[PDB]
Amino acid sequence: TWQRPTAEYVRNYEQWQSQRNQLQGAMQHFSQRFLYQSSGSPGAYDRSFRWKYHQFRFLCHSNALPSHVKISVSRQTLFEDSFQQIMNMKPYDLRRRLYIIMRGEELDYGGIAREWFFLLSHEVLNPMYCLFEYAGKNNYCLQINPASSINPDHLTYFRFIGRFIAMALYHGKFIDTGFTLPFYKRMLNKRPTLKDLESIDPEFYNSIVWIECGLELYFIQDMEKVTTHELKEGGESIRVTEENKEEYIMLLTDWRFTRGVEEQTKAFLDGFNEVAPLEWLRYFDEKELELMLCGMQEIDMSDWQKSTIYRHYTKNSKQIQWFWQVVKEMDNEKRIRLLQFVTGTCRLPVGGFAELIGSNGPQKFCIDKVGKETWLPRSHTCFNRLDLPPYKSYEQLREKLLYAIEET
Ligand code: NA
Numbered sequence: 567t568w569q570r571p572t573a574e575y576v577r578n579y580e581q582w583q584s585q586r587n588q589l590q591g592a593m594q595h596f597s598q599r600f601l602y603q604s605s606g607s608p609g610a611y612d613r614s615f616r617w618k619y620h621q622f623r624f625l626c627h628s629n630a631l632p633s634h635v636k637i638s639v640s641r642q643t644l645f646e647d648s649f650q651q652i653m654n655m656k657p658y659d660l661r662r663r664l665y666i667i668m669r670g671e672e673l674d675y676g677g678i679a680r681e682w683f684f685l686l687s688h689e690v691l692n693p694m695y696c697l698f699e700y701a702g703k704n705n706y707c708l709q710i711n712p713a714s715s716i717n718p719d720h721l722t723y724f725r726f727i728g729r730f731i732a733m734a735l736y737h738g739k740f741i742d743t744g745f746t747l748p749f750y751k752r753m754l755n756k757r758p759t760l761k762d763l764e765s766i767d768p769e770f771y772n773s774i775v776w777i778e779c780g781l782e783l784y785f786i787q788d789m790e791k792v793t794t795h796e797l798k799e800g801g802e803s804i805r806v807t808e809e810n811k812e813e814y815i816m817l818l819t820d821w822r823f824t825r826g827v828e829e830q831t832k833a834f835l836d837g838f839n840e841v842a843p844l845e846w847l848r849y850f851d852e853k854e855l856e857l858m859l860c861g862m863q864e865i866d867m868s869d870w871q872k873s874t875i876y877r878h879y880t881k882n883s884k885q886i887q888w889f890w891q892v893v894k895e896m897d898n899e900k901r902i903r904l905l906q907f908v909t910g911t912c913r914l915p916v917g918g919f920a921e922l923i924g925s926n927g928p929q930k931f932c933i934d935k936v937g938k939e940t941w942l943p944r945s946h947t948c949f950n951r952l953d954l955p956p957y958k959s960y961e962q963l964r965e966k967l968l969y970a971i972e973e974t
Contacts, residue, residue, distance in 0.1 A: 567694035568717045573889045578693040581705060588916075589688050595916055596684050599740050599861025615899060618849040619858065625846050626661070626736050634663040637682075641668055644682070645689040650724050652733075657840035660733055662762035668670040687741035690727055697723060697830075698786040701766055702948070709766065710791065710834075721833040728837020731859065736842045740770030740861035747910055748823055752831060753844060758823045759841030760815070765910050765947045768925060770822060774815060778808035789825050797821055805974060851974040853906045860912055866919075867894065870931065875936035885956055886933060888963045900971070905972050910947030924949050934959050942970045 601619060610621030630877060631786045635655070639647035652660065665675060691698055696717045701707035714720040734741045748766060749756040763771040777783075785801035788794045797817055798804070806814045813895050824831075838844060841876075847855060871890060879886055893901060902912050907930065915921040922930050925948040937943065937955020943966060944953045957963040 569696045569713075573664060575693055575753060578700075582691060582693055585688065585691075585705070589685070591685060592916060593681060595744065596740070597680065601738065601858070601862060601973070615752075615854055615857070618854065621849065622735075622737065622796075622846060622858070626738075626842070629661065631658060631662045632666050635659050636665045636667055636743075638667045638669065639682070644686055645692070648686055648724075648730070653722070653726055657729060658843050659737055660729060664733070664737055665766065668902075668972055679737070680739055683739040683741055686730065686793065687734075687743045689731070692883060695723065696720070697727070702708055702923075703927045704923065705744070706923055706925055707766055709749070710827040710830045714827075714830050716915050719912070721829060724830045724833040725798070725837035728834040728839075729841050731834075732838040732841030735858055741859055741915070745856070745859075747852045747856065747906070750855045751925060752823070753835065753838065754847060754850060754852060754855060755844070756852065758874075760819055763822060767822060768948045773786070774818060774822075775816075777811060777815060780808050782813070783808075785817070787818070787821055795821075795825075807927055853912070853974075856906065856912055857902065862898065862902060862912070863914060864898060865905065865914075867901075869918040873922070874931045874933065877932060879935050879954075883935075885935070885954055885963060888957070888960050889967070891960070892964050892967055900968075903971050908945045908947065909950045923948055942966050942973075943969070 574857070589612065602616060604623070605620060606616050606624045608624060611617060637648065639649050639651070664679050668682070691705075694767070696711055697714050697720060697795065698708055699711045701709055710724075712723070717723065731741065731743075733739075741817060748762045751762070752759045760771070760774065763774060780793045783806040785797045785804040785806050786794055787797050794802075796802075798813075835844065850858065870893070876883070881887075893904065896904070906912050911924065915923070919931055922928075929950050932949065932951040933954050934951060935956050936953040939955050939957060939959075941955050943955065945951060946953070954963075955966070957966065
C-alpha cells in the first residue's frame, strides 16, 4: 500500500500492530480522561482554562444544526468507512449530534462515539498511508511525513484528518493521535520558536545554536532522492554572512517546522476550519489546545515522586523538598501544565511515570541543579528534564516555577 517496503517501514509496521493490541487493552485507561462538567454562557472573563473551555463549548452549541447524523462503519474497516462518509457529508452536518453505527453491534451511543474517536485516532497513524512518521526512537515525536506524496491521495486524507480532529473538539471527545505542541502552535497561528526545535530535533537545535570562522553557507536548505529549496527568492545566490544571520536562523527555524509539509498542513487546516473555524480557538495556548483534544488525567503525585530521578540533587536536597511541596499545593490542572512544560505533553503512558519515554527511549522524569538563582527554571523535553536553579527560598522557587509554567 503506497510506499515500497524499507527496513524501517517494516519496523514501524510492527510497532503499529503491537500498538493495536495494546490499544485494545488501553481503552479502560482512556475512558477516565475528563474535562469539565457542562456549563450555556460561561460567565465573566477570568483568564482561566475553565472559562475558555466553556466559551468554546458555547460557540459549538450555538452554531450547531439540530438533529443528528449517522456515521455507519465496520470495526475492521474503520478508517476507510469513516473517510467516505465524512468526506461525502458537507462540513456543517458534522456539527449535528453524532450517531456512530458500528455494523453488527447493538445502547450507550456516547460510549460508542468515544471508542470510535479513540480507535480512529490510532488508525490514522498506520505506516501504510505514509502520512506520519516519528522523529525519535519508537513512536517519539509524531510529525507529518515530508514524503506523504508517495500516497497520491495524501492531501484528501489530511483534509479528512482535519475534519476528524475538528469533530473531536466540536463534540467534546478525546483523541490520542499524539500531535506535538508545535503542531498545535500551528493550528493557533503562533510561530514555533528555537526552544521548540529542541523538542523535535535536538541536534538540529544544537547546530542552529552554534550558528566567524564558520564554513560556507547559503540562504538555502537541502532537503531529501534530493531537492534543494530556496529559503527566500534566489537564495542559492544569497550567501549567508557569518555575521548577518538572523534572517538565516529565523527563516531556518521556520523552515525546519515547514519543510515538505506545507500542503499537507494547509490541507489539514482547511479540513479543520470547514467544521470548526480556527478562529474559535483564539483564547487557547498550545498546551490548553492539547488538553482540549486529549483530556485531563488525574496526576498521581506518589507515582510521580517514586519514578523521579535526580542529578546533583537527592530527594533530601532542600530545593526538591520545596518542589514537591509546591506540586502538592497545585490543583490537578497546574500539575498537568508542569507535566507539559517538562515532558512536552499532557499524555502519560499506560502504567505511569516509570515508563516515561524521551527521544533516546526509556527516560524518567528528571531534575538537575543547574541555573543561576536569577534564572527561571527551564526544561529539555526530549530528556524529560527540569533544570531547577538552586534557589535560596521556598517563595523564590515557587514564584519562578509557577511563572515558567504558566508562561507562553
Ligand atoms: Na518527553
